[PDB]
Amino acid sequence: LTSNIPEITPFLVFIIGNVPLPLGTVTILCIDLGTDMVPAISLAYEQAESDIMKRQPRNPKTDKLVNERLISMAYGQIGMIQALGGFFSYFVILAENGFLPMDLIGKRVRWDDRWISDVEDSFGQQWTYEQRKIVEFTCHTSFFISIVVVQWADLIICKTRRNSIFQQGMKNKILIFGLFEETALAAFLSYCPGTDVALRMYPLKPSWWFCAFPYSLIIFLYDEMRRFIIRRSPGGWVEQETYY
């Protein structure tokens, strides 16, 4: 439920701020049914944190499976950071090719037209229609890769609901395999010849792959300090506000 935000926010900005389209349909589908599945199917193999045979039976009317405390995390805090990282990589790709952030607001009408073969950028160059479309597609590819990068820290902060990573431990071999495969698939979809023809995903330059790293570390640190006050402070604000 965390990756839904960095998947819907781009269209909301496409209609509101009038910027070119950041994320494509063929990228959302490749994430939802590809990358996300293996790491999430692996989360099931996780061991206990405390003695489960000690607590009383759950209540059916009050304790649920999906409560608002979860929505506040996935839709409210982690997914938001994921969206910021995706938009960051986006603006970087468009700024390095000639389209600065000040000139992107208000361009969709001419950025989409199929018959305007002269679109001036921030430096005065004239871009044909297919040329600007290739850049938009390369932005979809890097946005999808940014999503994978942030899913790393999301799978790690989702491994433990309360306990710390330095306590439980990374003894789950399936989760490790999920991260490795999740990265190999993204690299394969971008670098294989004939992918920019079949699926419309162009190769990335090596400096772009590092635009989502800081957001991922931040997600890890935020959730780590989150899962700390809950331990030291039982019954406080952090508990009745963020404990799934």
């Binding site: 439920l1 909301l12 209609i15 939802d32 049914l33």
Partner: protein
């Protein structure tokens, strides 16, 4: 219960971007098409499987 929750935020975000698409200028065909896109976009294909 989970399905209920999900469908709630999807129809809330759609009704909100419809009123917004009317305060900015878009025609009714675009505002209606936008609503349908936002709702369907809030559905997770693999969580049930």
């Amino acid at each position: 219960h989970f399905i209920h929750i999900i469908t709630g935020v999807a129809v809330f975000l759609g009704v909100s971007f419809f009123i917004l698409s009317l305060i900015l200028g878009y025609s009714w065909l675009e505002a209606v098409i936008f609503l349908i896109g936002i709702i369907v976009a809030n559905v997770p294909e693999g969580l049930l499987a």
